[PDB]
Amino acid sequence: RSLKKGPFIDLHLLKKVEKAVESGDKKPLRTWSRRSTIFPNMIGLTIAVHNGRQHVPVFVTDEMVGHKLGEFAPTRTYR
Amino acid sequence: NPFIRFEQDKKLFRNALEVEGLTKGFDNGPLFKNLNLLLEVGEKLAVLGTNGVGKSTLLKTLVGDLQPDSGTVKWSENARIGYYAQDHEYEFENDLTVFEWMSQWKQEGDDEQAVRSILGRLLFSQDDIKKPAKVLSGGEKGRMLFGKLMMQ
Amino acid sequence: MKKDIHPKYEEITASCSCGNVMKIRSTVGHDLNLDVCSKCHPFFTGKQRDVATGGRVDRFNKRFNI
Amino acid sequence: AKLHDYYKDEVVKKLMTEFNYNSVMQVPRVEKITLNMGVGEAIADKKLLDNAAADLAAISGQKPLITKARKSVAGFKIRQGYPIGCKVTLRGERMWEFFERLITIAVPRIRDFRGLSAKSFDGRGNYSMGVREQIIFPEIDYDKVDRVRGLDITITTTAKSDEEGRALLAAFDFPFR
Amino acid sequence: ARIAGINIPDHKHAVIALTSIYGVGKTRSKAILAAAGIAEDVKISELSEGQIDTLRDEVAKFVVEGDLRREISMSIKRLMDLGCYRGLRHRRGLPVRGQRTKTNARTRKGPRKP
RNA sequence: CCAGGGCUACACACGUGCUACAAUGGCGCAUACAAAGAGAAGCGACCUCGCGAGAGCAAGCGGACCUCAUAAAGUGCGUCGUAGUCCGGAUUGGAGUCUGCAACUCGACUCCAUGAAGUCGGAAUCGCUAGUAAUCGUGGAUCAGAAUGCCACGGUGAAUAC
RNA sequence: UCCUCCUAAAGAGUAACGGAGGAGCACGAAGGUUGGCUAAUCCUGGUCGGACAUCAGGAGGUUAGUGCAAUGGCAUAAGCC
Ligand SMILES: Nc1ncnc2c1ncn2[C@@H]1O[C@H](COP(=O)(O)OP(=O)(O)OP(=O)(O)O)[C@@H](O)[C@H]1O
Ligand SMILES: [Mg+2]
Ligand SMILES: [Mg+2]
Ligand SMILES: [Mg+2]
Ligand SMILES: [Mg+2]
Ligand SMILES: [Mg+2]
Ligand SMILES: [Mg+2]
Ligand SMILES: [Mg+2]
Numbered sequence: 001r002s003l004k005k006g007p008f009i010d011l012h013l014l015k016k017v018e019k020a021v022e023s024g025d026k027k028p029l030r031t032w033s034r035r036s037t038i039f040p041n042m043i044g045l046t047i048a049v050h051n052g053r054q055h056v057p058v059f060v061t062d063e064m065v066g067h068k069l070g071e072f073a074p075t076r077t078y079r
Numbered sequence: 080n081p082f083i084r085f086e087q088d089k090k091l092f093r094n095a096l097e098v099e100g101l102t103k104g105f106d107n108g109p110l111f112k113n114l115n116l117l118l119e120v121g122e123k124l125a126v127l128g129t130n131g132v133g134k135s136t137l138l139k140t141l142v143g144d145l146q147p148d149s150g151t152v153k154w155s156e157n158a159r160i161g162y163y164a165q166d167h168e169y170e171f172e173n174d175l176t177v178f179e180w181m182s183q184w185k186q187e188g189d190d191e192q193a194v195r196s197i198l199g200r201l202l203f204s205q206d207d208i209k210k211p212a213k214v215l216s217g218g219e220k221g222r223m224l225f226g227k228l229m230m231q
Numbered sequence: 232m233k234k235d236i237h238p239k240y241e242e243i244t245a246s247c248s249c250g251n252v253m254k255i256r257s258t259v260g261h262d263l264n265l266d267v268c269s270k271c272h273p274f275f276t277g278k279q280r281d282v283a284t285g286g287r288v289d290r291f292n293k294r295f296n297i
Numbered sequence: 298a299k300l301h302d303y304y305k306d307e308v309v310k311k312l313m314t315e316f317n318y319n320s321v322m323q324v325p326r327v328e329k330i331t332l333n334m335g336v337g338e339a340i341a342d343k344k345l346l347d348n349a350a351a352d353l354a355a356i357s358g359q360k361p362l363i364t365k366a367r368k369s370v371a372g373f374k375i376r377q378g379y380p381i382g383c384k385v386t387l388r389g390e391r392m393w394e395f396f397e398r399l400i401t402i403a404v405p406r407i408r409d410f411r412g413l414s415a416k417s418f419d420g421r422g423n424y425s426m427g428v429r430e431q432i433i434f435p436e437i438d439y440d441k442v443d444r445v446r447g448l449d450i451t452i453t454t455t456a457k458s459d460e461e462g463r464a465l466l467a468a469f470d471f472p473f474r
Numbered sequence: 475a476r477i478a479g480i481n482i483p484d485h486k487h488a489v490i491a492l493t494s495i496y497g498v499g500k501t502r503s504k505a506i507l508a509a510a511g512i513a514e515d516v517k518i519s520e521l522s523e524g525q526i527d528t529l530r531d532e533v534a535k536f537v538v539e540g541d542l543r544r545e546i547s548m549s550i551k552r553l554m555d556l557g558c559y560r561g562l563r564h565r566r567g568l569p570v571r572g573q574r575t576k577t578n579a580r581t582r583k584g585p586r587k588p
Numbered sequence: 589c590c591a592g593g594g595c596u597a598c599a600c601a602c603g604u605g606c607u608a609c610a611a612u613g614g615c616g617c618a619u620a621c622a623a624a625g626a627g628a629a630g631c632g633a634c635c636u637c638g639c640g641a642g643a644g645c646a647a648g649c650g651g652a653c654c655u656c657a658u659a660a661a662g663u664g665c666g667u668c669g670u671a672g673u674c675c676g677g678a679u680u681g682g683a684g685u686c687u688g689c690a691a692c693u694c695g696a697c698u699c700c701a702u703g704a705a706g707u708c709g710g711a712a713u714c715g716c717u718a719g720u721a722a723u724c725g726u727g728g729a730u731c732a733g734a735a736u737g738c739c740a741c742g743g744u745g746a747a748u749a750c
Numbered sequence: 751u752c753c754u755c756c757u758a759a760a761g762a763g764u765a766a767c768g769g770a771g772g773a774g775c776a777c778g779a780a781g782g783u784u785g786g787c788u789a790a791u792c793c794u795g796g797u798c799g800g801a802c803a804u805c806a807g808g809a810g811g812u813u814a815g816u817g818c819a820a821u822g823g824c825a826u827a828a829g830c831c
């Protein structure tokens with residue numbers, strides 16, 4: 001919920017998705033920027049989100065284009 | 080010893096009844112003069128007085144079958160009334176089998192397995208549930224109305 | 232039939248909001264006014280337009296004022 | 298009725314031309330419509346059998362026969378003779394007019410209308426249909442309803458092959474897919 | 475009266491009898507009456523059919539019981555099969571907006587059980 | 589030294605609190621009566637825009653003058669007539685605003701919709717002797733933002749002590 | 751004490767502390783007559799509906815039914831209205 005400034009994405013991840021769409025699909029990208037929103041352009045990649053100790057790979061899809069990256073990586077376990 | 084127990088499906092709060100200025104009389108005029116009362120929840124009201132006076136016809140007005148001269152009777156919102164009339168012949172003039180007569184009042188959520196349980200607790204065993212409802216004893220009929228109140 | 236155990240059956244004037252005037256016999260005893268019929272049913276367009284909610288990319292791009 | 302005349306004027310010629318018959322009697326025709334309401338829980342609530350009978354007599358202007366159980370099955374705790382459901386058989390002009398006032402107004406009113414399946418055939422030329430609710434018919438004023446019961450329609454025709462029975466129902470503007 | 479599902483309550487001021495629709499609250503109810511020219515104080519019983527007719531169509535602008543009860547059902551179902559964090563909370567019946575589950579949260583947990 | 593996570597985890601138990609369960613009350617309109625305190629990368633009038641949280645320009649003030657800042661219970665009229673209710677506000681979906689590099693885990697507030705438990709609480713147990721108890725609002729420290737806690741101020745204002 | 755089957759050797763009968771089961775009733779209809787009707791079991795299509803309920807077709811053929819144990823019967827039905 002970041003008002004009228006537009007959607008926020010870390011710079012080091014903006015180039016990572018940009019330089020990856022050029023060459024197609026590759027190995028999952030490793031990122032710690034959980035706070036970065038999912039732009040429509042990074043659909044189809046498997047960016048790996050760091051939930052504290054391990055990187056979980058999320059397959060970006062059409063419906064997941066408004067939620068932040070960390071929304072899809074549970075950071076604590078239970079049972 | 081029959082096992083009778085009345086329960087209550089939806090308990091209601093605050094006042095259960097209110098009667099405001101219920102003067103009424105047939106041909107003596109003041110059968111009961113300027114009645115005014117408010118009946119709470121959990122009351123066990125015993126209406127006494129004995130003979131020819133409106134000892135009944137109060138209950139008949141409260142249920143509504145005897146229109147009052149003046150006044151208004153406001154039952155509670157969800158008030159469901161089980162009536163056991165003093166003279167109850169009209170509900171047995173029709174000649175149904177005891178089983179069908181008790182099954183008339185089965186509610187939403189019970190079987191004729193649960194219908195016959197009331198008769199069993201009321202001591203109608205296997206043949207006395209085949210008699211016509213017309214031919215029954217006075218006590219065996221009062222019990223059969225108790226089992227309709229319990230069922231409702 | 233079997234001597235007046237069935238319900239009454241008389242002709243009624245069933246008419247749609249768009250017309251579709253039909254003279255049928257039915258177990259109502261009173262005329263009815265209802266929606267469209269199969270004559271003008273949107274079967275070629277209702278299921279085409281049934282899907283309306285979906286697609287978050289245009290919702291994201293509509294907010295893109297920056 | 299109107300649909301009977303429609304059939305005997307147009308569909309006979311259409312289907313004779315299509316299937317290369319030689320006699321008017323060879324082209325199939327609707328024989329009867331069977332409507333049933335299997336309440337199942339009649340034993341749970343017998344007066345719901347009377348409610349269902351009223352609903353089905355409203356849907357079609359014929360009193361329902363109350364069918365009885367045939368075999369004592371221990372899967373649902375019912376025995377021989379126990380009433381289970383209601384049924385009505387429609388033939389002739391009442392059949393034709395019920396068919397008409399189904400097709401024209403009852404079918405379009407179903408919620409989430411997709412289209413009646415063409416594979417709902419018995420391999421001899423008969424059709425079966427579930428409606429999921431009776432409010433879809435105009436015979437209920439939202440007053441008799443305490444359940445959301447539905448009908449089973451079975452169109453029984455004198456057709457011999459399923460492809461033969463398909464075209465007959467198609468020619469009556471049936472809401473197929 | 476009779477509006478989308480049922481506007482059964484009579485003897486209620488129309489501004490409030492309309493609340494009984496799944497989707498019509500207080501300020502959305504007041505917009506309906508104001509955009510149709512009916513006074514708030516007027517009871518539904520006093521409300522003649524001459525203005526109920528323009529009341530049935532007024533509610534059609536906004537979503538109502540039949541559509542809304544599914545419109546939100548898709549929204550909850552959208553999260554659960556998406557696998558989002560808010561979807562995970564919905565599956566287990568735990569608070570979704572990030573609040574105390576240590577001792578409170580009996581509304582979403584349910585009755586207290588051992 | 590750094591990035592991300594945790595202290596916010598949830599079958600459960602306990603302590604201290606806030607809001608209620610309504611009619612000596614809820615809501616709408618109108619109109620009275622305070623004390624104390626804070627402010628310079630700070631408080632920020634008036635005007636315009638927005639249903640609203642707020643936004644744009646922007647005077648005054650390191651101050652008995654300027655701002656935060658409209659006290660609320662109350663009073664007058666109207667409606668609701670004992671219902672899970674025009675009580676209650678949890679929970680949830682959608683749409684936002686503002687701080688802040690950044691609001692997913694994990695902020696506050698606003699708008700539309702849904703509207704739960706709750707109809708005076710078992711054994712038991714706590715506070716209070718007068719401007720006290722009860723209730724009603726106001727401010728400050730901490731602080732970029734973030735209190736129902738803590739500290740502080742006033743309004744109405746009791747019962748009883750053999 | 752009575753009933754049914756096997757031992758019982760293709761008429762009847764035939765024993766054992768031989769092998770197996772039943773009876774000490776029921777029904778004013780479950781008796782009489784007249785008129786009609788035909789089952790079990792799966793195979794295909796449908797609201798709750800499910801392996802099994804009711805519906806509609808087809809195969810099947812009496813593999814069902816008989817107030818009560820077994821044997822012999824029963825469609826012209828002795829079975830069901
Ligand atoms: N149906 C009626 N028609 C005419 N007059 C009636 C009727 N019912 C009652 N009354 C009159 O009203 C009077 C009131 O009778 P009510 O039923 O109150 O008596 P009661 O005290 O209940 O009698 P009891 O104990 O003898 O049954 C009667 O005595 C009679 O005069
Ligand atoms: Mg802590
Ligand atoms: Mg100062
Ligand atoms: Mg409750
Ligand atoms: Mg021999
Ligand atoms: Mg011999
Ligand atoms: Mg011899
Ligand atoms: Mg016999």
Ligand SMILES: [Mg+2]
Pocket residue numbers: none
């Ligand atoms: Mg015979």
Ligand SMILES: [Mg+2]
Pocket residue numbers: none
């Ligand atoms: Mg015989």
Ligand code: NA
Pocket residue numbers: 134135136165
């Ligand atoms: Na009496």
Ligand code: NA
Pocket residue numbers: 216217
């Ligand atoms: Na007697």
